């Protein structure tokens, strides 16, 4: 699947909705074909790989055991309740899979709030005991770079990989292990509606003339002030982001946001 000249990437799917994988397919300059043909060697990825079943398992073992080393990108939370039974691949628990593979990686990136912090299946009452990768695998010494969001901006994944390949190390990380180059500012301090916030000009409802005129969405629940992400700067799909679409930020790059940021339409 690999060896030679392009760095090997092993991409794992735990308890996930595949939105993070889809977000990587939206990669722009570079696009995903450049990334898979020129930049990287994508050596395991259940969504798009040709092999299935035993052939896929063999592809995974060949990549993980390569003497050239591999980078792991991990999507989804790890279900830990009932000894990991709520999530299995090839009849192995996700907890066991990740416990065996991630300590062998030269670097691990947890991609998306589920992999970084536990995410939607970890929201109360967390029936499957879902955990983020670093929480689940603390005891094995795994320290994944956390690229948060639901899903993250793919700019932030490619930027972190490129940095890693150039500098042979992680970039500066915050106290949640997120790169400060992408997560160092609140989405609010970057928001175009900040002058209305400062002036106390809040939309009282989505149907209001204040909302039509672009007033601040804080009274409608916006979590921009407590959320670290680069959404207003980079935008999504080269064109938009939630509050420019008129909707409050729901805090999706923050740990436990499903419980901390709810009700989503209150502050």
């Amino acid at each position: 699947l690999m060896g030679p000249r392009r760095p090997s990437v092993v991409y794992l799917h735990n308890a996930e909705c595949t939105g993070c994988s889809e977000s990587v397919l939206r990669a722009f300059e570079p696009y995903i074909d450049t990334l898979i043909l020129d930049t990287l060697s994508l050596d395991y990825h259940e969504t798009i790989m040709a092999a299935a079943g035993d052939a896929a398992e063999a592809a995974l073992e060949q990549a993980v055991n390569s003497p050239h080393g591999f980078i792991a990108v991990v999507e989804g939370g790890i279900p830990t309740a009932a000894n990991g039974i709520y999530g299995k691949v090839a009849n192995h628990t996700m907890l066991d899979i990740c416990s065996r593979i991630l300590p062998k990686a030269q670097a691990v990136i947890a991609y998306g709030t589920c992999a970084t912090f536990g995410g939607v299946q970890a929201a109360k009452p967390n029936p499957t005991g879902a955990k983020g990768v670093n929480d689940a695998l603390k005891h094995l010494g795994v320290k994944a770079i956390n690229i948060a969001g639901c899903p993250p901006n793919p700019y932030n994944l490619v930027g972190t990989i490129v940095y890693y390949l150039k500098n042979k190390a992680a970039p500066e990380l915050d106290s949640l292990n997120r790169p400060t180059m992408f997560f160092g500012q609140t989405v609010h301090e970057q928001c175009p509606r900040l002058p209305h916030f400062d002036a106390g000009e809040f939309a009282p409802s989505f149907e209001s003339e204040e909302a039509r005129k672009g007033w601040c969405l804080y009274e409608l629940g916006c979590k921009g002030p407590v959320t670290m992400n680069n959404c207003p700067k980079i935008k999504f799909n080269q064109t938009n982001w939630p509050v420019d679409a008129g909707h409050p930020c729901i805090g999706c790059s923050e740990p436990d946001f499903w419980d901390a940021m709810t009700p989503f339409y209150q502050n």
Binding site: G19, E22, L25, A27, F236, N237, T239, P242, A245, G246
Partner: peptide
């Protein structure tokens, strides 16, 4: 990429759009 971008023009972002509310949509 372009096909998905079409959803973000009205719907904020793809994946996981953010423009629907009870009662209608937010994207003036």
């Amino acid at each position: 990429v372009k096909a998905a971008r079409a959803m973000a023009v009205f719907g904020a972002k793809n994946p996981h759009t953010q423009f629907t509310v009870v009662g209608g949509v937010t994207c003036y």
